[PDB]
Amino acid sequence: AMTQQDFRTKVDNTVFGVRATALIVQNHKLLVTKDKGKYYTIGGAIQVNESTEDAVVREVKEELGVKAQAGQLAFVVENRFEVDGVSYHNIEFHYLVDLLEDAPLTMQEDEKRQPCEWIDLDKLQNIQLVPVFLKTALPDWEGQLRHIHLEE
Amino acid sequence: MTQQDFRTKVDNTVFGVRATALIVQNHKLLVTKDKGKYYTIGGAIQVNESTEDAVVREVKEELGVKAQAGQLAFVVENRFEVDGVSYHNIEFHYLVDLLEDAPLTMQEDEKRQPCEWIDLDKLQNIQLVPVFLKTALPDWEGQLRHIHLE
């Protein structure tokens, strides 16, 4: 009751769902967080019956604590990979989010805090960014929604 | 082995990912009819299956013919009700290329339905679902489009 159902399911050793990702770009830099030597973007499962736009705004609210608007949908990604005997299969909607307040210096997820870093679009190629397709797709983006396949 | 569908039901809501085959030939869309309404060829993608492979498989299952996925036209977020059950789909709509002639009939779950080729400018003149196609398909301009929830 009153925890809304997430658009994510686990069956035996398979997980599958739909995610929204915030690609926050300001001053030619992408907002990322560093954890365990790798860089990640803000994102999470959408809820059942929730638009991916509302999902990305909600996730920015949760992780960064600021108001935002979804902005342009840049990528729809089919992402497939395995970790520890479990397959993960997500459809991901990557939005060029507009923050309506200043980004904080830190963010958190599941009560674990991680630092905020801003990395220049043309330098993403020189960091361990995950997904990874973003290292080139983001600086090469031409204003048109793209379909992406990412596989391990 | 039987593969899991990318579809789940929790309480009174079914949520999943669909591949839809928008087969267009001679300026007409191949649709199927059931109880007054018209539907597209397609169905749930499988867990760990690409949407391209899903659409080709759906065409094989429902039409019995070989096909290629072709251009992705739409990525659709779709909410609707059927018989009191809520549905929330993400749908990938492909402009499929058939590699054989289309049959006169489709089958799904061993129930047959007639298929018909309808002019794109006449989609607004059938009870087609989902309903965005009636305007979006004849207006399509060659670029992938996101169809959002209201």
Count of C-beta atoms within a 10 Å radius of residue A133? 17
Q: Which residues of A135-149 are buried (b: 16+ CB within 10 A; e: fewer)?
A: bebbeebeeebbebe
Q: Which of B72, B1, B47 shows the shortest CA–CA distance to A80?
A: B47
Q: Which of A22, A65, A29, A25 shows the shortest CA–CA distance to A44?
A: A22
Residue B146 contacts A, CB cutoff 8 Å: yes
Residue A14: closest CA among chain B residues belongs to which residue?
B47
The backbone torsions φ and ψ at residue B10, rounded to the nearest 5 degrees and listed phi first, read: -125, 125
* Cα distances (angstroms) measured from residue A151 to each of A17, A130, A141: 15, 12, 20
Rounded to an integer, what distance in angstroms lies between the CA atom of residue A14 and that of residue A16? 7
Rounded to an integer, what distance in angstroms lies between the CA atom of residue B6 and that of residue A146? 22
Q: Which of A41, A39, A46 shows the shortest CA–CA distance to A19?
A: A46
Three-state SS for B136? helix
Set out the domains of chain B in order of their start, with CATH numbers: 2-150 (3.90.79.10)
Rounded to an integer, what distance in angstroms lies between the CA atom of residue B102 and that of residue B115? 9
Asked if B114 contacts B31 with a C-beta cutoff of 8 angstroms, the reply is no
Say how many CA atoms lie within 13 Å of A135 toward its Cβ.
12
* Cα distances (angstroms) measured from residue B79 to each of A17, B2, B56, B92, B100: 16, 28, 24, 14, 33
Asked if B48 contacts B40 with a C-beta cutoff of 8 angstroms, the reply is no
Q: Taking the alpha carbons of B95, B3, A85, B7 in that order, is the dihedral positive or negative?
A: positive
Rounded to an integer, what distance in angstroms lies between the CA atom of residue A59 and that of residue A141? 23
Residues making up chain B, counted from first to last: 150
Q: Which of A133, A105, A141, A118 shows the shortest CA–CA distance to A24?
A: A118
Technique used by the depositors: X-ray
Q: Which helix (H) or strand (E) holds B133?
A: helix B133-136
Residue A11 contacts B, CB cutoff 8 Å: yes
Residues 32-71 of A with CB under 8 A from B: 48-49, 51-53
Rounded to an integer, what distance in angstroms lies between the CA atom of residue A46 and that of residue B88? 11
Q: Annotate B46-113 with DSSP letters as a single string.
A: BTT--HHHHHHHHHHHHH---EEEEEEEEEEEEEEEETTEEEEEEEEEEEEEESSPPPSEEEETTEEE
Rounded to an integer, what distance in angstroms lies between the CA atom of residue B42 and that of residue B34? 15
The backbone torsions φ and ψ at residue B126, rounded to the nearest 5 degrees and listed phi first, read: -130, 155
Place of tokens 């679902």: B129
Which value in Å is the resolution of this experimental model?
1.6
Q: Which of B34, B26, B42 shows the shortest CA–CA distance to B117?
A: B26
Alpha carbon of A48: minimum distance to chain B alpha carbons (Å): 7
Residue B148 contacts A, CB cutoff 8 Å: yes
